[PDB]
Amino acid sequence: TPSMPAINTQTLYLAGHSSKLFERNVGCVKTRYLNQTGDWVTRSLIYVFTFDTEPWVTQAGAFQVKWEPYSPLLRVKASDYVRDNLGAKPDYFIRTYDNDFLLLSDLKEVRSTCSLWVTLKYVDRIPETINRTFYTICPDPVPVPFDERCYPGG
Numbered sequence: 001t002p003s004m005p006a007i008n009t010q011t012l013y014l015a016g017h018s019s020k021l022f023e024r025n026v027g028c029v030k031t032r033y034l035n036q037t038g039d040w041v042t043r044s045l046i047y048v049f050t051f052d053t054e055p056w057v058t059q060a061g062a063f064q065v066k067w068e069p070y071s072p073l074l075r076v077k078a079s080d081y082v083r084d085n086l087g088a089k090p091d092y093f094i095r096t097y098d099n100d101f102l103l104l105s106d107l108k109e110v111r112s113t114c115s116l117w118v119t120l121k122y123v124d125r126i127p128e129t130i131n132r133t134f135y136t137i138c139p140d141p142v143p144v145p146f147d148e149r150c151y152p153g154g
């Protein structure tokens with residue numbers, strides 16, 4: 001079966017989210033794998049804050065994730081900074097996933113907010129099936145448009 005992306009070693013990019021989650025001046029949102037200790041994977045949360053900040057500066061946070069096989073929950077132990085400023089929760093509902101995408105939902109909201117994550121394979125072109133699922137399940141879906149500037153080099 002496909003490998004669960006959250007505990008895998010490929011970088012994940014935020015491709016879509018519910019409007020309510022929206023943070024003004026936050027762009028290029030992605031997560032890189034750092035290491036693993038026991039059942040916990042450590043990843044970074046990378047982004048750019050575009051207001052009154054130099055254009056080459058990347059903001060960075062860190063968090064840990066745990067996924068028991070076939071669990072519908074992703075466990076998240078986010079840093080104090082990430083919990084305080086980016087609203088990270090201790091658990092997320094896993095709607096679906098494949099080798100190169102992950103769709104997460106909030107646990108405690110009745111009108112559950114969502115986030116769609118993809119690997120490099122789909123950053124310039126989200127497959128129609130994933131896009132359709134995202135627009136079906138997610139309240140107030142906001143796509144994150146492709147931007148060349150959010151990547152190393154160009």
Ligand SMILES: *[C@@H]1O[C@H](CO[C@@H]2O[C@@H](C)[C@@H](O)[C@@H](O)[C@@H]2O)[C@@H](O[C@@H]2O[C@H](CO)[C@@H](O[C@H]3O[C@H](CO)[C@@H](O)[C@H](O)[C@@H]3O)[C@H](O)[C@H]2NC(C)=O)[C@H](O)[C@H]1NC(C)=O
Binds near residue numbers: 126127132136
């Ligand atoms: C990802 O999906 C988006 C959502 O698609 C819409 O919802 C799905 C669940 C399904 O019902 C699908 O058929 C719907 O289109 C896509 O966005 C939609 O794209 C439409 C076409 O570009 C757009 O439409 C408008 O334009 C036509 C032009 O003739 C008008 O007739 C029509 O009335 C609309 O004004 C539609 O508005 C738009 N929806 C939203 C909410 O953005 C999106 O393109 C797709 N992306 C990929 C990569 O496949």
Ligand SMILES: CC(C)CCC[C@@H](C)[C@H]1CC[C@H]2[C@@H]3CC=C4C[C@@H](O)CC[C@]4(C)[C@H]3CC[C@]12C
Binds near residue numbers: 006
């Ligand atoms: C990808 C996996 C492995 C876990 C990620 C967990 C945490 C860090 C994720 C899950 C949902 C994410 C949020 C989803 C949507 C937005 C809106 C955007 O405007 C700014 C980033 C922000 C606010 C994200 C910040 C990081 C976030 C809180």
Ligand SMILES: *[C@@H]1O[C@H](CO)[C@@H](O)[C@H](O)[C@H]1NC(C)=O
Binds near residue numbers: 034036037042062
């Ligand atoms: C994993 O990364 C974190 C974050 O930088 C670090 O604190 C930790 O020492 C690293 N090593 C291991 C094996 O946990």
